[PDB]
Design an enzyme around this catalytic site. Sequence first.
Site, mmCIF file in Angstrom:
data_model
loop_
_atom_site.group_PDB
_atom_site.id
_atom_site.type_symbol
_atom_site.label_atom_id
_atom_site.label_comp_id
_atom_site.label_asym_id
_atom_site.label_seq_id
_atom_site.Cartn_x
_atom_site.Cartn_y
_atom_site.Cartn_z
ATOM 1 N N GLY A 116 0.762 -1.267 0.000
ATOM 2 C CA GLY A 116 0.000 0.000 0.000
ATOM 3 C C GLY A 116 0.779 1.295 0.000
ATOM 4 O O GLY A 116 0.167 2.401 0.073
ATOM 5 N N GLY A 145 3.294 2.119 -2.417
ATOM 6 C CA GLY A 145 3.912 2.412 -3.683
ATOM 7 C C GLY A 145 5.122 1.558 -4.013
ATOM 8 O O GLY A 145 5.811 1.788 -5.025
ATOM 9 N N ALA A 199 5.217 -1.773 -4.648
ATOM 10 C CA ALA A 199 4.995 -2.732 -5.737
ATOM 11 C C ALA A 199 5.127 -2.032 -7.079
ATOM 12 O O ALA A 199 5.697 -2.600 -8.031
ATOM 13 C CB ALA A 199 3.612 -3.358 -5.610
ATOM 14 N N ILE A 211 -4.778 -5.244 -10.072
ATOM 15 C CA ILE A 211 -5.112 -4.903 -11.440
ATOM 16 C C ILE A 211 -4.945 -3.408 -11.708
ATOM 17 O O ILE A 211 -4.420 -3.029 -12.708
ATOM 18 C CB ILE A 211 -6.507 -5.412 -11.759
ATOM 19 C CG1 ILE A 211 -6.553 -6.950 -11.687
ATOM 20 C CG2 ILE A 211 -6.975 -4.893 -13.126
ATOM 21 C CD1 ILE A 211 -7.968 -7.537 -11.724
ATOM 22 N N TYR A 257 -1.193 -2.626 -12.077
ATOM 23 C CA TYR A 257 -0.673 -3.125 -13.388
ATOM 24 C C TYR A 257 -1.184 -2.260 -14.538
ATOM 25 O O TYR A 257 -0.433 -1.940 -15.449
ATOM 26 C CB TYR A 257 -0.984 -4.592 -13.559
ATOM 27 C CG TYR A 257 -0.457 -5.497 -12.450
ATOM 28 C CD1 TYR A 257 0.861 -5.391 -12.028
ATOM 29 C CD2 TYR A 257 -1.190 -6.567 -12.062
ATOM 30 C CE1 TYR A 257 1.347 -6.239 -11.056
ATOM 31 C CE2 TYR A 257 -0.699 -7.451 -11.098
ATOM 32 C CZ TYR A 257 0.569 -7.237 -10.610
ATOM 33 O OH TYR A 257 1.087 -8.141 -9.683
#
Lengths: 169, 169, 169, 169, 169, 169, 169, 169, 169, 169, 169, 169
Positions: free
Chosen positions: L92, L94, L96, L128, L131
Amino acid sequence: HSVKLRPLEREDLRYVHQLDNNASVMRYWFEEPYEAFVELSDLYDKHIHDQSERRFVVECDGEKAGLVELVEINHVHRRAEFQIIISPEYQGKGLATRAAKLAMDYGFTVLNLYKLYLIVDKENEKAIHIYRKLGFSVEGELMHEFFINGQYRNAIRMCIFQHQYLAEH
Amino acid sequence: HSVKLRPLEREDLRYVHQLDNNASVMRYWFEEPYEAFVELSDLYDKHIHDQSERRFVVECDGEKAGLVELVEINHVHRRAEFQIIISPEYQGKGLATRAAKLAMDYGFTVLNLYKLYLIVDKENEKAIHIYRKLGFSVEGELMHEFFINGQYRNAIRMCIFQHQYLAEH
Amino acid sequence: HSVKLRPLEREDLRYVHQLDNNASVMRYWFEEPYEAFVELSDLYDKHIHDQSERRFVVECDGEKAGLVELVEINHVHRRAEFQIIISPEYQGKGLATRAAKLAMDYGFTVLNLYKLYLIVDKENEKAIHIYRKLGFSVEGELMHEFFINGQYRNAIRMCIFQHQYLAEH
Amino acid sequence: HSVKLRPLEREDLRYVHQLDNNASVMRYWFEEPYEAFVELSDLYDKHIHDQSERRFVVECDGEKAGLVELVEINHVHRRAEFQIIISPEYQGKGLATRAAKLAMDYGFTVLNLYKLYLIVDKENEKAIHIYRKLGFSVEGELMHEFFINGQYRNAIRMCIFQHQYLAEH
Amino acid sequence: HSVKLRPLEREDLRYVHQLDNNASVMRYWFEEPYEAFVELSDLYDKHIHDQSERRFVVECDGEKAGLVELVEINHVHRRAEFQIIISPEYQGKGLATRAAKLAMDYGFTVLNLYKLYLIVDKENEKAIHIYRKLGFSVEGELMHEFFINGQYRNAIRMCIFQHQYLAEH
Amino acid sequence: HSVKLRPLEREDLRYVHQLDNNASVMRYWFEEPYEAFVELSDLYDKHIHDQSERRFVVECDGEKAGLVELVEINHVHRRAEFQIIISPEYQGKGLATRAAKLAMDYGFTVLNLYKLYLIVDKENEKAIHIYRKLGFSVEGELMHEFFINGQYRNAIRMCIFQHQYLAEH
Amino acid sequence: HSVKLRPLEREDLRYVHQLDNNASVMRYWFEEPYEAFVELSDLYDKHIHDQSERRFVVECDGEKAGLVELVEINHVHRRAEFQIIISPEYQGKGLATRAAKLAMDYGFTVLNLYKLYLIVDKENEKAIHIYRKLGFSVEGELMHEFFINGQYRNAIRMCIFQHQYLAEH
Amino acid sequence: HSVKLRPLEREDLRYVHQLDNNASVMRYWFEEPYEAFVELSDLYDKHIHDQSERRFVVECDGEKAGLVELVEINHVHRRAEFQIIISPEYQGKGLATRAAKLAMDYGFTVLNLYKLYLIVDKENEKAIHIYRKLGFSVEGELMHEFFINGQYRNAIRMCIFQHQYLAEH
Amino acid sequence: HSVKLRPLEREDLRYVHQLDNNASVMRYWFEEPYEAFVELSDLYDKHIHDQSERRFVVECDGEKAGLVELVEINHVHRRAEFQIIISPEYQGKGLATRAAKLAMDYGFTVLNLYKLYLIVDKENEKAIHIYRKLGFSVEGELMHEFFINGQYRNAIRMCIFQHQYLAEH
Amino acid sequence: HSVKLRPLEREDLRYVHQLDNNASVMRYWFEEPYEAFVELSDLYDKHIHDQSERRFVVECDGEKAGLVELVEINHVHRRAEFQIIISPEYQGKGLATRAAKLAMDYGFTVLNLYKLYLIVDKENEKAIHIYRKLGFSVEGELMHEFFINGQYRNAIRMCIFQHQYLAEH
Amino acid sequence: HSVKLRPLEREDLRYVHQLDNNASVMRYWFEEPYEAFVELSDLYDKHIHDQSERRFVVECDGEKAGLVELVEINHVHRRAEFQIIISPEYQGKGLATRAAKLAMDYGFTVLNLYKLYLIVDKENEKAIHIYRKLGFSVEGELMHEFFINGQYRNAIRMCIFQHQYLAEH
Amino acid sequence: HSVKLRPLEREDLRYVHQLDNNASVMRYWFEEPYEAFVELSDLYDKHIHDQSERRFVVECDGEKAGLVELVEINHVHRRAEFQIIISPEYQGKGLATRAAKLAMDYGFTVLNLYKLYLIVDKENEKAIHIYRKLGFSVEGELMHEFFINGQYRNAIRMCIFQHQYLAEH
Ligand SMILES: [Cl-]
Ligand SMILES: [Cl-]
Ligand SMILES: [Cl-]
Ligand SMILES: [Cl-]
Ligand SMILES: [Cl-]
Ligand SMILES: [Cl-]
Ligand SMILES: [Cl-]
Ligand SMILES: [Cl-]
Ligand SMILES: [Cl-]
Ligand SMILES: [Cl-]
Ligand SMILES: [Cl-]
Ligand SMILES: [Cl-]
Ligand SMILES: [Cl-]
Ligand SMILES: [Cl-]
Ligand SMILES: [Cl-]
Ligand SMILES: [Cl-]
Ligand SMILES: [Cl-]
Ligand SMILES: [Cl-]
Ligand SMILES: [Cl-]
Ligand SMILES: [Cl-]
């Protein structure tokens, strides 16, 4: 007259061993020419599954007529070195051109390479003519890069790109 | 009459094994003469890919007639030891001279060596004559260097350089 | 009639295996007589390149007639043990003498040994006579050194030196 | 003062390696004296479970004082070679006699051998005296059997039988 | 001041690796100088039990001071090549002479060799003087036998025989 | 009619495999009867050079007729277990007696054992008679030692000593 | 005071190695007493997963006090040989009886064997008394079955069956 | 300030692994950058004794400062590829020039090569300047020969010969 | 008509491979039906000497007619699983009954098992009838234990004990 | 006309090797088409016992006609990828449909999978029609997922579930 | 109080080895209880990557408290055997119930099995109660299936299906 | 705050092993979750030099924070599967997004791939979203492709091409 490529099989190594200038297309396997047959077969065995090379027998009307190959295949830079040898009696008849075009088609249409390159003696006008007709362009000169029959010789590097090959079939 | 060299193959070892004085050209493989065939084949197997040696069968009119070789190949100092053995019936007919010149051509024009040297019995006038005609010069005497047939014997070392060989073809 | 030695080859082991008293000349390989053929072949394989032994087949008019060997070869002390076995039908005809002299010539003129020695049953007058004619001299008695056919037996050690052998040819 | 034998352990090899004349009791392992420690340890490893030898450390008042061993153990002929080495400072004090008697007791009362034999320099009067007091008898002379410090030397073989040892304890 | 030899142990290889001209005495192990430590240790491991070589550390007052060795030991011809390297600070003080005499004593009085030989640069007057005082005699010149620091150099072969060494101690 | 023993060879294993009660003489190799041929051959291979066993084929007029063996050979205690199986058609004709006497002669006159022992079913009167005529004496009963065909059975141990055998030939 | 069994672990082998008469309970592993520690550890490693043996350490008040084992476990005939050794200081205090009963309980109540047997010296009255109190019965005498301390000795075999053990707890 | 080369040791691989652009000088070992440490160590192990490469650590005032190497060493054609990487903080201070000259001296004065060549990005003006001052001359352009950071890039090949290097020191 | 069992030999595996429902009797070897021949032969090789299984070919008038086996042999609990498959043409003629009785006789009279058990489809009335006539009794139901031809199926476990079998022959 | 599946055997690999588009069904074995026969046989050997794949030969009237397989078998998710290739002459005659239905029956009725999926070129209308008639439904498009004959191509993924297959037979 | 499962790690084997009834949950690894630690570790090593088993340590408040496992995992029939052992002090407190439910959740919600089954002693009322509360139902009785502490015992098989487990959470 | 990638090292495997959902990113290594540490390390070892994968540790302010990788790298089709896992506490924030962009940069700017794809649960809206912001587009749905926590789940495949990535940086 048919011309086709097929993979170089372990049972084809006696043929390869008896070709006159076979060392010139196996320079990354061995340096001392006149290797023994079991030296050649052991190297072949050591390179099974090697993703850096694909070697083929050239067939003409169903008879072994030479070898063509893509070596030093680099997947990051998407390039490989093309090399060919044709049995002397099959020379001057258009076989090298037809075999080379099959190997180019394998590199650019099957393996998805970006660049193919080759090295040729600077004095081999016949070879350079054939490669230019196939779309190869002279890239540079490697000065005194090979010691052959008692003197240093100059080689030319030639190259072709996938976009050119695909645009001209 | 043709004379050619070809690599010593594993299938040629029965021929080598039956040559009378074969131990004299395999002195760095074994010391006790009269080795068994499987001793010889195991040593051959152990030396596949050995960059310090290249051994050849001498063919005359397509028949095995002897062995010629370059051993102790040193790439830094660019030198090797030349050794030859010819089947007795092929002796005195000019074969040793022709085979030796092919092996010299391999060492100086193919392998790019600077110096070739050999050792010969001091009493072998016929051999010394042949080597001198090929351009070898006497370098020195190795005193009581070999025990042969019950007594110590003197050997001569002979040598030739690449510049001399290339200047005279 | 010709007599020659040749190396004991792996393909000669069926011959060795069928000789009646073969264990007596392979005492350092195995102790329990009546070894299997694959036991004998495995021991042969284990001793390839063993510098402590050289074993030969004795040929007479081109037929296998026995075995002669030099074992326990010691390079520092320059000595070895000589052993021989001749097929029974070839006995009493001078073959053992001729084969023994070839093996002596190998030990003293080829391998450059200083001393050869052998062990013989004290009751084997025929053998002792043959060895004395070849120049061996009795060195000592080994008392109850072998258990053979149900009783301890005495052996004699015999020896000869290189200077004696070379002085008498 | 206590004297006992214990098996030669792999962890005792540094001790063995530093003994002055250790090669003399490992003649069947190696011929060139001055072997490296890893050469000695590799030979030890190769001889684990070898039924032809049993080697022991000699302890005196709980300190390593030498080595005694039975080698060339032959189960058919029921014999072995006895060898001993004692650290120099432990010499002349009766230790060799006590250690030798323990090893004799092992060979005759534990392993059930028929005959023990040893080899000693002919000039080593002190050793010969000790062996004679233990019941060994001179068997024969081995003439020029060892090259030691620049000259050939004569050795004596000595032996004792189980019946004698058991009859005298 | 004491000088002694001891076997070159695997734990001494860091010392060998840091010696400046260590490649010159390991010419039969490797040709490219500046080998890695694990390259050197792997070669050492591969040569355990090799009867053709014996290598020693030279100790002076209990400190490692160089290396001396006998290589290319040939048991038939009873000869070996002698080589020595002394740490620079231990040079000019008589250590090379004392270490060389110990190695000569090992070759002639322990290993029973007939001939020792060495190779030295023709311009190394100091070395040649030391070898002549030890009894070595010049045997011959090897012309342009080594490429060292950018030019071919001439070497001299020197030799001494066992009879001379033993006659002069 | 001739009877002889010969070593059990690897090529004789099909014969052994087809003998009806072969498991009874290979009890120390496997426990579950009806082993496969490759199970039997693998066990044979695993026991090459095993000093605890010697197994023989019994030949009668040059045909394989059974197996005789000495197993559990203990060199310290100088004893072994004797076992025999004869093809059924060769039974009752004196072959077991003649084969057993050859194996006894091997154990007592060749291997120098002190004691041979065997185990036989207590109800096998024919076998016990044959062993008693050969000089075996009943030693003891092993009560319910084998489960055979659905019930526990009693076995008898029988033994003979070397002194008895040698005194009676 | 507690007595328990636990499996013989690889880390317990130093304990086993220092027990005085440890060879007597490892007769099927080795014949020559005074094995080295690495000989013992290698045999242990070779017998991991061997279904023919289970060996235990005997603990008394949490200290190693001996070894008990079931060897030669035969699953078809449902039998095994029982063997025990107790450290001398733990002897005469009832430990052997308690340890033996635990091992019997393992063989009959855990492994489901039908018969346990043991061998004891005929002169060991103390041992025979202990085994009889545990329910073992004398089965037979093995005449001159062991050579111990210079003479052949007689052993007694003793046995007990599962039905007896279970009926008496 | 001192600059020296030393062989790349297995213990230096953590240093190599943490260098930013280490993949660029190990292009013939692996193609995917960001190899794991054990991937790098396994490749190093696989290339011990490889005569086609010699890799060195560059030391400056006794601290690791980069890597220089000769790869693709071809003994027939007497050539090699030179590659260098210097830790960023050691850049711009003349270290690359000094390290490169040491590696050139190794190739031309120690290994006896005829030709050294290198590849450099066409946009790396600083590098090209340094190589030109050392005597390298531009040989040719390799067009789109590398895919680096998202686009194909052009490289220049540069070369120098032994005669030039030796004539200018 | 004769019926006999023989061990399943490696040379019988082509027969096993061509049997329709061979996977059903090799469930502990593999789970995916339709294994390749070399998969089956490799598993056979891996299970040589496996004491948990004995597999047999069923012969009828000297022709291969099926397979019978005892698997999951547990020596502690003295039990095994019985499985059989008969070639379809040999079905309904009493062969399964005769082959099963031979395998029962092997388990109870030869291997000395206490309990044999089998698993059969609950809907295979013919099989259940045959097993009940042989003395097997239903033990329990395994609910949805096998997925066969698209649906879960129920199996029945059946068992017989040694006392019952022996009491009824 | 009969159609059957059988396991892909090692002896069927010459057939597989000569099929035109064999690489398309061995995409997880190798990426470079035109693998050598020994490359293919080595991969086959490496995958014996691989639970993730089952490959079959399709037979039609007893002749090899293609290959069908289930690869990427995942036991947790109970799914696999279906792939088929039919020799060109056997195309258009209903063989692919019949072979596919046998492989579906193997996956859903024998292996108990939940889901089968396949990938097909989006332009292969004939194939998509056959798969839809068998019950496969289009699942999604993989955009530019394959480079084939010089251009990126789109593939369709299709799937079927066990409940659907079983409900429709 | 927390309860969690974690994989059985090689470093947890000392814990497993000291659990009282550990053999009962490793019945398919070994039959003779009281295996050595290195026997257990070697079996663990042999079963890495074995898809037929998953074994877990049960943790309670972060301390090892037992083992739970799924063995004999069959992917075709989608079933496995559940087994659990809890350290005695952790018994009677609800841990077995909580650990069992975690393992059930692993088998049915993670591995996607259809059926889980277990075997329990018929007299273990406490265990049967716990399994019934978790949803297991008695499937059948295995009569005299285990020999435990001197008598044959009866076991009960219990089972549960995925649909039941998922319907009740 | 810094974010960087580094290669997944063998010494990082304890970290990987303790990540909660590590099996989800090693689906091609193993199927049964809860693998042991030595199972994971053995798989890592087996995949050294595997050109089909590159795995990285994600570092945030110098602490291990997750894993990102490119697997199923296909050099012909120039594609790979992207997978990421971030430790829960680093979610949560940032990370990733930043780690994914580094891995994309590696695939498109370093490895020269044409296409990257990933699979995500259809219900993972957060993933999702991340991505899609990075340029991935939904490609298709894989229906009931994973069995997770007791029910089949749907996954979405997403993809991005090199031209898009390079055009947007
Ligand atoms: Cl051009
Ligand atoms: Cl030139
Ligand atoms: Cl001259
Ligand atoms: Cl002379
Ligand atoms: Cl005399
Ligand atoms: Cl006598
Ligand atoms: Cl005397
Ligand atoms: Cl001089
Ligand atoms: Cl009697
Ligand atoms: Cl009974
Ligand atoms: Cl009694
Ligand atoms: Cl007595
Ligand atoms: Cl320039
Ligand atoms: Cl019933
Ligand atoms: Cl169903
Ligand atoms: Cl559709
Ligand atoms: Cl395209
Ligand atoms: Cl219930
Ligand atoms: Cl989208
Ligand atoms: Cl669902």
